From a paper:
Here, we identified monoclonal antibodies (mAbs) capable of cross-reactive binding and neutralization of animal sarbecoviruses and [name]-[name]-2 variants by screening single mouse B cells secreting IgGs that bind two or more sarbecovirus RBDs. To deduce recognition and neutralization mechanisms, we used single-particle cryo-EM to solve structures of Fabs from the seven cross-reactive mAbs complexed with a [name]-[name]-2 6P spike trimer. Here, we characterized mouse mAbs elicited by mosaic ([name] mAbs) or homotypic (HSW mAbs) [name]-nanoparticles using both structural and functional analyses, showing that mosaic nanoparticles induce potently neutralizing antibodies that cross-react between animal sarbecoviruses and [name]-[name]-2 VOCs. Structural analyses revealed neutralization mechanisms, potentials for intra-spike trimer cross-linking by IgGs, and induced changes in trimer upon Fab binding.
Single-particle cryo-EM structures were determined for [name]-31 Fab bound to [name]-[name]-2 WA1 and to Omicron BA.1 spike trimers at resolutions of 2.9 and 3.1 Å, respectively. In both structures, three [name]-31 Fabs interacted with “up” RBDs. Despite 15 substitutions in the Omicron BA. [name] compared with the WA1 [name], the [name]-31 epitopes and binding poses in both structures were similar (root mean square deviation [RMSD] of 1.0 Å calculated using 1,267 resolved Cα atoms in each Fab-spike protomer). [name]-31 Fab binding to [name]-[name]-2 WA1 and Omicron BA. RBDs was mainly stabilized through interactions with FWRH1, FWRH2, FWRL2, and FWRL3, and all CDRs except for CDRL3. The [name]-31 epitope overlapped with class 4 anti-[name] antibodies but was shifted toward the ACE2 receptor binding site compared with CR3022 (class 4), consistent with its competition with the C118 class 1/4 mAb. Conservation of the [name]-31 epitope is consistent with its cross-reactive binding and neutralization properties. For spike trimers complexed with [name]-31 Fab, distances between the C termini of adjacent CH1 domains were measured as 52 and 49 Å for [name]-31 Fab bound to the WA1 and Omicron BA.1 spikes, respectively, suggestive of potential intra-spike crosslinking. (F) [name]-31 Fab-Omicron BA.1: open trimer conformation with potential for intra-spike crosslinking by [name]-31 IgG.
Numbering used by the authors:
A (entry chain A): 294 to 620, 636 to 676
B (entry chain H): 1 to 9, 11 to 30, 35 to 59, 62 to 72, 74 to 109, 114 to 128
C (entry chain B): 27 to 68, 77 to 142, 153 to 178, 187 to 210, 212 to 214, 214A, 214B, 214C, ...
D (entry chain B): 827, 854 to 874
E (entry chain L): 1 to 57, 65 to 72, 74 to 80, 83 to 109, 114 to 126
Write the structure that this text describes.
């Protein structure tokens, strides 16, 4: 109890009349809040998913995207997706951790040829149209698009280059339309029995069967370099808490305190504020554009007001410089003054000479 | 492509700790929060837990609580196993995981048993 | 031709709000009352390749909007990455690639980009609201610290341009946009849109004059008002 | 004409009481 | 923690004989956002580490790809193989994924 704390701090079994500072009142953070500015721009993976005509397998479109927040959660949320196999990276860790740049390649190919477009796997089309490097870190997204990309008559929009003179370089797209010299006799630009044109036309039809239907296949390439990383998943955010002492993480400021609305007006470029002593005084909420004042958690000295143990064993506790809305247990004749909020003493309007000085004109005493 | 190497099996004194390393080759471990699993010969497979390279916050199976601990080091893509005072039946072959939709990448396996 | 930088080129060092605070910060600044190179243009091609050094305090008072971007780069060659800033009336563009910069880079209404002969290893591309348009002083500070390319802006309207010298008033430069770009920069060149006549009776550039100053490590005592803006400053080593 | 453990205690005599003495 | 019961029946059959293997999954696991359920199967050749056989309970990964369709609402999923050969001769475990407590399959073998 406070009286025994006073006895220990005085190292005497009898404490004389007076006020003794025994301990320190401290308010610990109840909650922890983390905020980052929300999505705003979004990296358009759905756009290359939603492209009406996917690029040719040999002339695969290379889309390098940077400086945007990427939402990979919608990719898992999307039901029509059928294949999400990943190599060197967790499918669900794209949101958690990020790379510097992302390459998206959109192409339409038959179902059996989808497995041919994979690292460490070579195919009749893959070796000459699109050969994924063995060691790249990325995910291949594939799904059936027979209804969207085929008709009863037949879809000949998508074609591939069957014959190529040399092995394809990694991350290289071949757009050459030269007639392949399959035969020993020179082609000279004229199709013949020996010379076969490398490009062949697929026919996509619903009746053509599964394993050969068109598949909208998108491969995402992630590479992290010395340059700063600009595309990342949505970092965790929490709700805003006002008038309660909480740990706050406003884009990595990492401070503790109680957050209140402030009348101060920041400049548009400015993010947080500092006082004369170079202490964070106000922060702007990244989610909104409002300005939040940061005042520290309430703390102060705990002083025990006691008459002599010869007189009595009752004690009144003073919490210096603390609003006792934030605070012997409260509810026992709790009275508030400038020196602090006094617990255990009842304010009396009549005035006597000072007995135990509390502060700011308030003096405690033991009387009936 | 992407390979996870298991540490060679070390004979361990009875009632002591045993450590097995799962280093990643061909790719940094930073993008992978690998999972540890234990398999006993002629017995069902079990899931030990997982490690994240940064803020690892490893969460273990309820049966293995307070006795099975696993950690990894981001530098050199190394991982580790921490298991001590294992009985012969409890000891099982440990594998690493790709934590995908299914565990695509698995270690070659470590047959570790208390033999001293 | 030279002109004194009478308390010009001061920018907000950081994004920290301060109210009625005299904050003394040590950062790369244009020293007060310092020598500033001043160039005239115009065909009379005068666009020297000025070294970037720590930074550049670019300025212009062209009421005809003659200034149409800047050129940056370590060597202005395809071997190294370079900055390209082109600012159109409808929309501005910032491209960062290994541009092979021609002898006379310019924009061709604008029909086709004619600023770079080659575009390989393109890593960065940015688009924002126009800033060079809307007789008035248009002063910028460019920096390259820790791989972040920093730009500051302030469009002060000045009633008098007859003396053809920078005003003696003070105006701190609010940051406009910062670009994450890890390359190094050791050269600077200014862009002017050369029209079909150059491709020059149709297009006139008689009023295009731009002042260039170089930043230096200095200690400044910045005065913030209760609103949070820098109203005045002093250079401790002046 | 500071919350790092620095607490400024109020004087026992308020300015009104000092003025009343005066 | 999720209750699982995998049929360990082993059939010594010639190639071209279908086999049906299913294991119950309690709580009827259902991923939010997408209709797909996170249930997977593994194929482990004797003396070799297990590898991903099937994921999402209805999607066939590249690598010996053939059918393996499974129909269920999270209460149960059935994995079917059209033909049995030495390559498919292995031990299979079905492990739930949507539920964070992961319990692996008891084990199922096939013979030629
Ligand atoms: C194609 O565009 C449509 C229309 O925007 C997308 O449909 C929704 O996209 C939002 C993206 O924020 C998702 O949150 C919704 O769940 C989508 N709803 C449906 C019914 O799809 C669609 O995702 C885009 N991509 C594809 C492949 O269709
Ligand atoms: C955050 O999202 C809300 C809801 O869509 C939006 O009103 C707000 O503008 C977003 N934040 C910013 C900084 O735009
Ligand atoms: C805190 O104390 C002040 C006086 O010091 C008082 O006016 C106020 O009502 C108290 N409570 C709150 C919530 O501010
Ligand atoms: C800052 O805001 C106050 C309050 O309206 C205003 O009186 C003052 O002029 C403003 N200062 C500037 C520089 O905008």
């Amino acid at each position: 109890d406070p009286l025994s704390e006073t006895k220990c701090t005085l190292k005497s079994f009898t404490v004389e009349k007076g006020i003794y500072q025994t301990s320190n009142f401290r308010v610990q953070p109840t909650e922890s809040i983390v905020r980052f500015p929300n999505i705003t721009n979004l990296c358009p993976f759905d756009e290359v998913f939603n492209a009406t005509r996917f690029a040719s397998v040999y002339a695969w479109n290379r889309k390098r995207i940077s400086n945007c927040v990427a939402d990979y959660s919608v990719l898992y949320n999307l039901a029509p997706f059928f294949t999400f196999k990943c190599y060197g990276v967790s499918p669900t860790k794209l949101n958690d951790l990020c790379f510097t740049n992302v390459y998206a390649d959109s192409f339409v190919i038959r179902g059996d040829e989808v497995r041919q477009i994979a690292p460490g796997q070579t195919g009749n089309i893959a070796d000459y149209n699109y050969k994924l490097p063995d060691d790249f870190t990325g995910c291949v997204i594939a799904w059936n698009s027979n209804k969207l990309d085929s008709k009863v008559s037949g879809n000949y929009n998508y074609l591939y280059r069957l014959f190529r003179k040399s092995n394809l370089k990694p991350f290289e797209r071949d757009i050459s339309t030269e007639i392949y010299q399959a035969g020993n006799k020179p082609c000279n630009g004229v199709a013949g029995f020996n010379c076969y044109f490398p490009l062949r036309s697929y026919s996509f039809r619903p009746t053509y069967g599964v394993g050969h239907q068109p598949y909208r296949v998108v491969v995402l390439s992630f590479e992290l370099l010395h340059a700063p990383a600009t595309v990342c998943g949505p970092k965790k955010s929490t709700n805003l808490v006002k008038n309660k002492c909480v740990n706050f993480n406003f884009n990595g400021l990492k401070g503790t305190g109680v957050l209140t609305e402030s009348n101060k007006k920041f400049l548009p470029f400015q993010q947080f504020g500092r006082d004369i002593a170079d202490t964070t005084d106000a922060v702007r909420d990244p989610q909104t554009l409002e300005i939040l004042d940061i005042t520290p958690c309430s703390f102060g000295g705990v002083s025990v007001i006691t008459p002599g143990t010869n007189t009595s064993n009752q004690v009144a506790v003073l919490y210096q410089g603390v609003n006792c809305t934030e605070v012997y247990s409260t509810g026992s004749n709790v009275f508030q003054t400038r020196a602090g909020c006094l617990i255990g003493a009842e304010y009396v309007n009549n005035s006597y000479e000072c007995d135990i000085p509390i502060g700011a004109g308030i003096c405690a005493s033991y009387q009936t | 492509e992407v390979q996870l190497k298991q540490s060679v099996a070390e004979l361990v004194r009875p009632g002591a700790s045993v450590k097995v390393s799962c280093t990643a080759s061909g790719f940094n471990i930073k993008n992978i929060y690998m999972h540890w699993v234990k398999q006993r010969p002629e017995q069902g497979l079990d899931w030990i837990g997982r490690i994240d390279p940064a803020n690892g916050n490893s969460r273990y199976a309820p049966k293995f609580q307070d006795k099975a601990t696993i950690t990894a080091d981001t530098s050199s893509n190394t991982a580790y196993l921490q298991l001590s005072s294992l009985t012969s039946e409890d000891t099982a072959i440990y594998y690493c995981a790709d934590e995908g939709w299914g565990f695509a990448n698995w270690g070659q396996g470590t047959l570790v048993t208390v033999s001293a | 031709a030279y002109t004194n930088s009478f308390t010009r080129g001061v920018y907000y060092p950081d994004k920290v709000f301060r109210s009625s605070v005299l904050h003394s910060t040590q950062d790369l600044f244009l020293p007060f009352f310092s020598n500033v190179t001043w160039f005239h243009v115009i065909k009379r091609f005068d666009n020297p390749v000025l070294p970037f050094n720590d930074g550049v305090y670019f300025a212009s008072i062209e009421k005809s909007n003659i200034i149409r971007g800047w050129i940056f780069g370590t060597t202005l060659d395809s071997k190294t990455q370079s900055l390209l800033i082109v600012n159109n009336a409808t929309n501005v563009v910032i491209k960062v690639c290994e541009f092979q910069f021609c002898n006379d880079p310019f924009l061709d209404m604008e029909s086709e980009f004619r600023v770079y002969s080659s575009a390989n290893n393109c890593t960065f591309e940015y688009v924002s609201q126009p800033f060079l348009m809307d007789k008035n002083l248009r002063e910028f500070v460019f920096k390259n610290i820790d791989g972040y390319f920093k730009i500051y802006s302030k469009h002060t309207p000045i009633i008098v341009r007859e003396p053809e010298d920078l005003p003696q008033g003070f105006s701190a430069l609010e940051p406009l946009v910062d670009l994450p770009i890890g390359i190094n920069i050791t050269r600077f060149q200014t862009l002017l849109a050369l029209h079909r006549s150059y491709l020059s009776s149709g297009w006139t550039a008689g009023a295009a004059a731009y002042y260039v100053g170089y930043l230096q490590p200095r200690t400044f005592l910045l005065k913030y008002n209760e609103n949070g803006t820098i109203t005045d400053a002093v250079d401790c080593a002046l | 004409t500071k919350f790092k453990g620095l607490t400024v205690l109020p004087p026992l005599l308020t300015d009104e009481m000092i003025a009343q003495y005066t | 923690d999720i209750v699982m019961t995998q049929s360990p029946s082993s059939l010594t059959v010639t190639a071209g004989e279908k086999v049906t293997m299913s294991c119950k999954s309690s709580q009827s696991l259902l991923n939010s956002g997408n209709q797909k359920n996170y249930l997977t199967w593994y194929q482990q050749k004797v003396g070799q580490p297990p590898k991903l056989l099937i994921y999402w309970a209805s999607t066939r990964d590249p690598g010996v790809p053939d059918r393996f369709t499974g129909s269920g609402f999270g209460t149960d999923f059935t994995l079917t193989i059209s033909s049995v050969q030495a390559e498919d001769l292995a031990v299979y475990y079905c492990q739930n994924d949507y539920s964070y407590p992961l319990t692996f399959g008891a084990g199922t073998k096939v013979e030629l």
